[PDB]
Amino acid sequence: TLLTFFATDARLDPAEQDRLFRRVMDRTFNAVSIDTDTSTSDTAVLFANGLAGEVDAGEFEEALHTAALALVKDIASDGEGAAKLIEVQVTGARDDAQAKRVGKTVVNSPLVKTAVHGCDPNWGRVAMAIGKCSDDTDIDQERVTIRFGEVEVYPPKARGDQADDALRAAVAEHLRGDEVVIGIDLAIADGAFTVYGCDLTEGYVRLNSEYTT
Amino acid sequence: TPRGFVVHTAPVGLADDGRDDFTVLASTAPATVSAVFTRSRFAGPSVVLCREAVADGQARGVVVLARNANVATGLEGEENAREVREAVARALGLPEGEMLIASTGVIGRQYPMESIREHLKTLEWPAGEGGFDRAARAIMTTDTRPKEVRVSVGGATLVGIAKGVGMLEPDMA
């Protein structure tokens, strides 16, 4: 269950406040997944009393966004059992909503979550995960690109196992960090979205098996 | 750090460890509210009352109970969600519809109502402002650390707290 509360002495236009709260929520708390298990109780609230006087809506929104994101990355790093934060950056999508759909599918793939947990540069599991968006028939495996960190591992340019081998090895390095990026481009249009999750560990399983929560 | 916000935290035995598990955040001033929630079909009674409470864009606080969700608890749990939300409003002299309620932890377990009833009878406004750090801790369940953040903007302060590291893919509106 997500519970998050924000408090400010900012004075804001009530209608602007709602609009901006929603925009930030959609890009942060609604952009994170530990275990896909959307709770019966998720609550997110902002209270703005007026005491510090008027604040620019855009400045405030920016500030809420930074606050929210920092909290989201906190949650992802602290995922039950996690050793690693996973950040999935999708670009070139048909629209932002498809980019989000693909990011979620990838960051919620148990096989992706365990490969990252073992530091296994098994990028083929990310190709699989993208592949599960089988109703997005404008995603073409020939046009899709996949990187871990700053290392593009798909598509093969030329052969043969190359190549994949080296750079496989470079992906293994980045995976050793506590924060892991998977970048994916669909080469459809301009849709973009980043989502946040974590690896899948024996610790997740033990806690949640042992463990009435 | 924001002006007008106070925090009450206390142990009410939602788990049997003497830890702060009952939180009241409140503004001493009227406050505009924005909120989004689970759309779960098993949405707890706490959620429904929150929706109703923010319908007028007006709210001053929230009571939070940790280590029990008050979900799938039937009419008993609905009654308990109302009683608790209302008793908090009443004890601070706020109108019901300006107090939200939120609850986290186990599903399918009734609140320890007598323990909560005894605590409510003692509840009143915190002396002095602040205590978000205390709120941050008192809301935790399977979190390993409290989560808290502070930003300054245009002479105002914004403080956020969050919790939740399992049963976590929010899809809130």
CA distance B47 to B30: 22
Longest Cα–Cα distance of chain B, Å, equals: 46
- DSSP label at residue B145: S
Q: Do A39 and B5 touch (CB under 8 A)?
A: no
The domain segmentation of chain B, as residue ranges, is: 1-173
Alpha carbons within 13 A on the beta-carbon side of B66:
26
B102 and A CB contact within 8 Å: yes
B 35-54: CB under 8 A from A: 35-38, 40, 42-44, 46-47, 50, 54
Q: Method of determination?
A: X-ray
Residues with Cβ within 8 Å of residue B108, at least 6 apart in sequence: B71, B72, B73
CA distance B22 to B27: 17
Q: What is the resolution of this structure in A?
A: 2.3
Candidates 3.40.640.10, 3.40.120.10, 3.40.50.720, 3.60.70.12; correct CATH number of B1-173?
3.60.70.12
Give, in order, the Cα–Cα distances in Å from B117 to each of A46, A83, B110, B123. 28, 41, 14, 10
Residue A190: its H or E element: none
Q: Are A44 and A85 in contact (CB under 8 A)?
A: no
A41 and B CB contact within 8 Å: yes
Rounded to the nearest 5 degrees, what angle is found at the Cα of A117, between the Cα atoms of B139 and B107?
30
Please tell me whether B141 is known to bind a ligand.
Answer: yes
CA distance B143 to A200: 16
Task: Give me the sign of the Cα torsion angle B143, A65, A88, A180.
Answer: negative
Q: Do A47 and B30 touch (CB under 8 A)?
A: no
Q: Considering the domain A79-213, what is its CATH architecture? A: Roll (3.10)
Residue B162 buriedness (CB in 10 A; 0-12 / 13-18 / 19+) = buried
Residue A149 buriedness (CB in 10 A; 0-12 / 13-18 / 19+) = middle
**How far does B122 lie from chain A, in Å, by closest CA?**
24
**How far does B120 lie from chain A, in Å, by closest CA?**
22
Give, in order, the Cα–Cα distances in Å from B168 to each of A42, B144, B150. 9, 15, 23
Residues with Cβ within 8 Å of residue B121, at least 6 apart in sequence: none
CA distance A87 to A182: 6
If DSSP codes are grouped into helix, strand and coil, which group holds residue A122? Answer: coil
CA distance B60 to A54: 19
In whole angstroms, what separates CA B151 from the centre of its chain?
22
Give the full edge-to-edge strand order of the sheet including B156-163: B31-37, A43-54, A3-11, B156-163, B147-153
- Taking 3-state DSSP, the helix, strand and coil percentages for chain A, each rounded to the nearest 5, stand at 40, 25, 35
If DSSP codes are grouped into helix, strand and coil, which group holds residue A138? Answer: coil
A 109-148: CB under 8 A from B: none
Instruction: Report the residue of chain B nearest A212, measured CA to CA.
Output: B106
* A180: its two tokens: 């892991």
Residues with Cβ within 8 Å of residue B123, at least 6 apart in sequence: B8, B24, B87, B88, B91, B92
Q: Give bridge partners of residue A90 from the DSSP assignment.
A: A184, A193
CB atoms within 10 A of CB B89: 22
- Taking 3-state DSSP, the helix, strand and coil percentages for chain B, each rounded to the nearest 5, stand at 25, 30, 45
The domain segmentation of chain A, as residue ranges, is: 1-78, 79-213
Superfamily of chain region A1-78: arginine biosynthesis bifunctional protein suprefamily (3.30.2330.10)
Q: Which of A56, A98, A73 is nearest to A187 (CA)?
A: A98
Residues with Cβ within 8 Å of residue A205, at least 6 apart in sequence: A81
Q: Are B167 and A39 in contact (CB under 8 A)?
A: yes
**How far does A35 lie from chain B, in Å, by closest CA?**
6
Which amino acid is present at B128?
G
CA distance A60 to B151: 9
Task: Please enumerate, by residue number, every residue of A annotated as part of a binding site for substrate.
Answer: 1, 80, 208, 213
Residue B93: its H or E element: none
Alpha-carbon radius of gyration of chain A: 19
CB atoms within 10 A of CB A31: 24
CA distance B52 to A125: 44
CA distance B137 to B127: 19
Rounded to the nearest 5 degrees, what angle is found at the Cα of B72, between the Cα atoms of A68 and B98?
50
Q: Give bridge partners of residue A198 from the DSSP assignment.
A: A85
* A172: its two tokens: 């293994």
In whole angstroms, what separates CA A100 from the centre of its chain?
8
| Cis peptide bond prior to A121, omega within 30° of 0 | no
Q: Strand locations in chain A, DSSP E?
A: 3-11, 43-54, 85-93, 145-148, 151-154, 179-185, 191-198
